[PDB]
Structures are given as structure tokens and as C-alpha cells.
Design a protein around this ligand. Sequence first.
Ligand SMILES: O=C1O[C@@]2(c3ccc(O)cc3Oc3cc(O[C@@H]4O[C@H](C(=O)O)[C@@H](O)[C@H](O)[C@H]4O)ccc32)c2ccccc21
Ligand SMILES: [Zn+2]
Ligand SMILES: [Zn+2]
Ligand SMILES: [Zn+2]
Ligand SMILES: [Zn+2]
Ligand SMILES: [Zn+2]
Ligand SMILES: [Zn+2]
Ligand SMILES: [Zn+2]
Ligand SMILES: [Zn+2]
Ligand SMILES: [Zn+2]
Ligand SMILES: [Zn+2]
Ligand SMILES: [Zn+2]
Ligand SMILES: [Zn+2]
Ligand SMILES: [Zn+2]
Ligand SMILES: [Zn+2]
Ligand SMILES: [Zn+2]
Ligand SMILES: [Zn+2]
Ligand SMILES: [Zn+2]
Ligand SMILES: [Zn+2]
Ligand SMILES: [Zn+2]
Ligand SMILES: [Zn+2]
Ligand SMILES: [Zn+2]
Ligand SMILES: [Zn+2]
Length: 737
Amino acid sequence: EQPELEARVKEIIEVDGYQFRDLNDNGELDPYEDWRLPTPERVADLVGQMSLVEKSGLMLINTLNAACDPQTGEFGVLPAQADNYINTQHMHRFVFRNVVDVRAEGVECTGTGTPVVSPAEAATFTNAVQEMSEATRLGIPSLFKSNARNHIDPAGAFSAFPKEAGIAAAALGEQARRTGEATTGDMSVVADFADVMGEEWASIGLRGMYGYMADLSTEPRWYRTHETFTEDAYLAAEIMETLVQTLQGEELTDNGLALSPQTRVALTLKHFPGGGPQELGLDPHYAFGKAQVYPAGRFEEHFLPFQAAIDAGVSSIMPYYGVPVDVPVVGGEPGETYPHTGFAFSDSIVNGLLRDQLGFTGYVNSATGIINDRAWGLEGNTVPERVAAAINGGTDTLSGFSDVSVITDLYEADLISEERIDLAAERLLEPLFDMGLFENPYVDPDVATATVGADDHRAVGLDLQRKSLVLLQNEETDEGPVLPLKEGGDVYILGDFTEETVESYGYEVTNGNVAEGEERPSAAGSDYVLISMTAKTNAGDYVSDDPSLGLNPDHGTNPSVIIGDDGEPLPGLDGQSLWGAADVCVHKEGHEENPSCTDNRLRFGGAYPWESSILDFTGMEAAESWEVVPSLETIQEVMAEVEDPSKVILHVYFRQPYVLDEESGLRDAGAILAGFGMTDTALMDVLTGAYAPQGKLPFALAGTREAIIEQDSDRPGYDETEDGALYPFGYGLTYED
Ligand SMILES: O=C1O[C@@]2(c3ccc(O)cc3Oc3cc(O[C@@H]4O[C@H](C(=O)O)[C@@H](O)[C@H](O)[C@H]4O)ccc32)c2ccccc21
Ligand SMILES: [Zn+2]
Ligand SMILES: [Zn+2]
Ligand SMILES: [Zn+2]
Ligand SMILES: [Zn+2]
Ligand SMILES: [Zn+2]
Ligand SMILES: [Zn+2]
Ligand SMILES: [Zn+2]
Ligand SMILES: [Zn+2]
Ligand SMILES: [Zn+2]
Ligand SMILES: [Zn+2]
Ligand SMILES: [Zn+2]
Ligand SMILES: [Zn+2]
Ligand SMILES: [Zn+2]
Ligand SMILES: [Zn+2]
Ligand SMILES: [Zn+2]
Ligand SMILES: [Zn+2]
Ligand SMILES: [Zn+2]
Ligand SMILES: [Zn+2]
Ligand SMILES: [Zn+2]
Ligand SMILES: [Zn+2]
Ligand SMILES: [Zn+2]
Ligand SMILES: [Zn+2]
């Protein structure tokens, strides 16, 4: 019965033969400290003793990163804003963004930037925050959330896995290697990944997540396909179910939430109802990309993975910035559409669709910056007006908003009722109770050291890397198929290959990667050419109100149209405006003097908006804000110096569903693999035949720019286009014989 209790400032108290934490420092036992009672009654007693500001502080979540002071050699101290957030704003939810790794010798604390911290230092930092939390009047604990950390970027000491779509490829491939079928995948691969991440996250006291993403990659021009699992809703549904079961547990409360003291990481699933179907792929972080469109009528299909995650008891939901355009209200009086505002502001979306229609009984966490920067559809409204609209729309905690004053001022003005703040407070405290943090909110920094990156954990990651690789093309030469490689030979490498690691498999290696200014050795005479290639955006120069860029008529107009609920188009989104005209710096709607641009530097990712359809390697080589790595020109030189292109092996990182266009000559390679992040050891283990590739594509690939521009943003595949798919969902070759 008795759970372990740790208390670093408040006192433990003996009652009825059991021990309890005395968090309000009166000395005797309140029902909220009494872990023998059901959680609703602990909540009831806690919210009853709370001041208004104390309850409003729960409705904020903000970045709280570890810092370093250059003078004791301590990394993992509290940042500048730690006292203000906790003691003035009364916050208990935080976003932890530091890279966790072992720092190189010679590294002191620099200036700004988010410092790298070790597992033990990270757990020390979060413990120190928990200590300051327990030091609050009622000793309510804190919750840390974080974005993903366990994936290779083609993190730190966390065990490295392929990206999300790599994990789906491995799941589908493994189902295929047993059943001969690739539908919803073998979820043991997903569970095996989530078991490692859960243990490592929990070990540093990181008990909550911004994610995972249930978004569907049905629009290939969306830069965020780099972190989607698949374009298929049914496979997404299966992956979210498995993630929640494994990371949150299978023990559901009577409120229907998978929350126990054995919950390792509570998920804040994103981005509800589905961030996938972005018009022209433009992302609603930016003002030109507010709109989500549903030409194929698949609004219901996109929230299907959220249904599955809600039914498995996911703890939290983050709505996206997007504005649904002309979307029929689900379970609604006919002819009714959802508001043309961001999802977090529409009561019909958050309370109506999410809670009433889909049955979600947890709390809602806004995407970051919706109040100041991305209150889409509320451009003329003020900050307090936007805050009231989101809370009253059904959002319980605001990310990136740290001014609790605004919430209290709205209550004293009867713009938010005390019933609403009480209802938010109940929902935000419920998971902290069930997760057992009122009993023990601390972690052992030395066990983090023994957990983060454990040998067996990295092995599961290595296995998943090798199983995620997808063989798309393996030509049959007169000597047999190109892959697996034969033992020995002269190998030319181009791209992100580490020469000595390729030499290590018994090959003589010529390195085509030379600094600019040197000669590149010719690939003539090579038995094998290995090219590891990808494309990246390069849009950091974008400026919304610059007449050279965002306001350049030679860059065209923004076709996106969003009619306000007032009947007049949103600024810059009438279907005829310059690309930059939707940014607040240009339209200046709203209560502020000369507002900064929200879109400058496209700093979250994505291409120049007028280049978002250029996913073909030939197009991307010529584009302003795309780059092919290594350059396609160099790849084409290389493929020609060897003459027989059947000796070229292309490993492609499809960060987005890039298009192998016939004009580029890439299809002429003897082998083509799709990789989703892996060590060179794992790629070489498969190339040389120690393991056979078995991954299957979790999204379709097109062969023409025309197919990209023609496909429905909300529809998977390319079967409705004239040119169709180059490779379908579920496709993947293996070694035979
Ligand atoms: O415009 C502001 O910039 C940020 C920002 C600023 C500094 C910094 O170092 C990081 C930083 O990260 C983000 C990240 C964002 O991404 C969204 O939110 C989540 C998140 O990570 O937070 C993700 O889980 C969601 O998938 C994603 O859709 C949005 C805004 C900001 C911000 C924070 C607070 C107020 C305003 C802003
Ligand atoms: Zn008693
Ligand atoms: Zn007490
Ligand atoms: Zn005391
Ligand atoms: Zn009250
Ligand atoms: Zn106070
Ligand atoms: Zn508090
Ligand atoms: Zn990426
Ligand atoms: Zn099921
Ligand atoms: Zn959009
Ligand atoms: Zn304030
Ligand atoms: Zn210890
Ligand atoms: Zn312990
Ligand atoms: Zn372990
Ligand atoms: Zn053969
Ligand atoms: Zn040698
Ligand atoms: Zn012109
Ligand atoms: Zn230009
Ligand atoms: Zn307007
Ligand atoms: Zn004003
Ligand atoms: Zn040249
Ligand atoms: Zn045509
Ligand atoms: Zn599509």
C-alpha cells in the first residue's frame, strides 16, 4: 500500500500507521496529501485551498532550460527566470529543451545559448526545480515536458533511433516479414522503441512530452513530414495506441486516463485534430500558412489517430495553429462549418469535437505562442481577448505565455468565470496526482547515468535503424544484383559517409568529399559508388515585408483564401496578395505600434513559400531556398565518371517525400535505398549483407512535380493524379537468395 515518499523541504507526517507528505506546512493531514483517497477527492480538497492566482498559475507552461554559471564548475543550475516563473507566476508546467549529452573536454559555459548537460546534471536541474516547487505554499510538484530526443538528425546521450517514419517503416517491414502483409504494422517494434525512451526520460525526471505527432503526411510539401510517422491513418492509429500503452501504461483510471505511478511519460499528443493537410504545404507557424484544406473530405480520417490515442487514455492534447477552411461540424446541424479561427480558439473544436464527440477527458495544452504571435483569425483582438477566447474555447494551459496577471485580470473583469478556472485547475492537477508526484517528485541523478544510453538500449536503436531502411531499387546486372556488395573492391564515397568506417568493412575508399577549392578525385575505375544524399531548406534570408522577397510581385501571389467569420478575408489571404502581406508586420491589424514580423528567417523550417512545391531534385538544385547535399551537379558528374551507373548506390534521406525526377538521372542508379536516420555501421551492415533490408515505405513517393502540385492535401498517395506514384505505400524490396 505504502508508496515511497521523498521530501526535501516540507516534512513527512505519521498517521494511521502510514506516512504522508505535509505539503502545506500546517503539520497535519489534509485529504489532498492523503494518498489513500481517490484522486478526485484529493483534487477537490486541493483546489479548495487554492488562491485564485495559484489556480491561474497552473494555466501557463513555458520554456525552463538548465543553465550554467561560469564559477563552481556546476552545469545544471536554475535559469534566470526560475524564481519569477515559480514564485511570482505560480507555474508548475515547463518545457525542457537542452540537449542531453556528454560535453567535450575544454567546454566551459559560454555566453547565452542553451547549454548541453549530462544525464546526471539534467536530473539535478529538474530535482532543483522540484525542490523549489515543494517550497511553494501548497508544495504542488512540477511537470516537465519536452520534444522528442531519441532520433538521429541526418540525440546526445539518449539512445538514437531512426526518425518517426523510420520506425513506421520498420513496423510495416516486420509485419511483412511474418505475414507477407503491410497494413498496420507489427507494434512490437513501436513498443520496443517506446520502452527504451520511457525508461530514459523518466530517469532524468522528464515525465511529460510535447508529442508524439499523430499528424498524417498526406501533404508532402509540409516541412513537418520529417517528424510524421506515416500518411496512413490506420497505421497512425495503431502507432499512437501502442505509444500510449507503453509510455503511459495500460492501467486506466475511472476517468479513463492511462495514469499510474508507473506512468513513465505522459503524452501531450499533437497536433489536434491533425496538422497534416496544410494548403500548399505552408505551415501555420507562419502567417502565409494559416489555412488547412480538405479537398478530399478527410477531416474525419485525420483525427482517427487521436481517437485511438484518446481511447487508450492519453493524458493531454495540443491543438494546432491551423485554421480549418469550410469544414463541416462533426455530429452537427447540417450546413454548419467550424470557425475560421485557430483550433485552440474554437469551442466547437476543443469542447465540441474533442470532448463531446471523441470523449476526451484530460486537459488541453495550447501550441506555443498562440497568444502573442499566432492568434489566427483574431488578428484585431487584443492579448487579454485572445487569452479569454482560448481558455473559454476549452484550452486549459497556454504554452509560451508566462503572464498570470492577464488571467487574474480577466477574472476580475468577468471575462473568465471561476467555474472555468476551477475546471482547468482540476484537469491540470489530476495527472500529477495519479502519476504519484505528490508522494515522490524526485529522481536519482546517478541512476540517470546508468540508464541514459545503456548498452542494451542503443542495441534496440541499432536494430530499429537496420530494420527501417527501405530498398527501393536493386538492379540485376550480369553478375547478379547490385546489393549486397561483394567483399572487397574500390569504393567511391560521396555524402555523409565516414571513410574509415567504410574502409573498416574491407574496402579501398576514394573520398569525393573535398573542401571547396580542392580537386575532387574522379570516380572512374570504381567498383562501387556510394552516395548518401538529401535535400535541405535554406530560407533563413526570408523577410516578409522586404520588397525583394515577401513583397516581391515577381514571386507571385498567395492563392490561399480564408474568409473571416466577419465575411471579409483575413489580411493577406484573399487569394490575390503578396506572400508577405499576411504577416502582422505588413497588415498591422491589432493593437500594437510597429510589430515585428512573425515569419522572418522561416526559422522553424520550410522553404520560401513560392518554392514549397519544388520537391523534385532537379527543381531543388535550381531553387533559391532549397539545397541538395551533396549538390546534384556533383552527383551527376560522379555518376558519369564511372560510366556504368549500375555501380552507384544511392542512400536518400527523404526528409520530405522528395521526387526522383527522370531528368535528374538518379533513377539510373543500380540501387536506391530510403533511409530515415542511421549510423554508418548500420547502413554498411545492410549494404554488405550482414542483414537484409526489410523496411517498407510508410508514405508514397511521386515521380513528377506535376503529381506533387495535383494531389489532395488531405488525401494519402497519388492515385488521384495523372502521373501517379513512383513507389506506393507499403513498397520495399529485400535480398533474395
Ligand atoms: O514564437 C515563439 O517561438 C517559440 C520559441 C522561442 C524560443 C525558443 O528557444 C524556442 C521556441 O520554440 C517554439 C516552438 C514552437 O513550436 C510549437 O510549439 C511546441 C514547442 O516546442 O514549444 C511544439 O511542441 C509544437 O509542435 C510546435 O508547433 C512555437 C514557438 C516557439 C516561443 C516560445 C514562447 C513564446 C513565443 C514563441
Ligand atoms: Zn484515519
Ligand atoms: Zn497539511
Ligand atoms: Zn517547517
Ligand atoms: Zn471556488
Ligand atoms: Zn504570489
Ligand atoms: Zn502553485
Ligand atoms: Zn529535418
Ligand atoms: Zn487496436
Ligand atoms: Zn497552412
Ligand atoms: Zn504578470
Ligand atoms: Zn543515489
Ligand atoms: Zn527510488
Ligand atoms: Zn535498461
Ligand atoms: Zn541471382
Ligand atoms: Zn587500404
Ligand atoms: Zn516581373
Ligand atoms: Zn526570387
Ligand atoms: Zn479581417
Ligand atoms: Zn488597446
Ligand atoms: Zn564541375
Ligand atoms: Zn501532364
Ligand atoms: Zn495528398
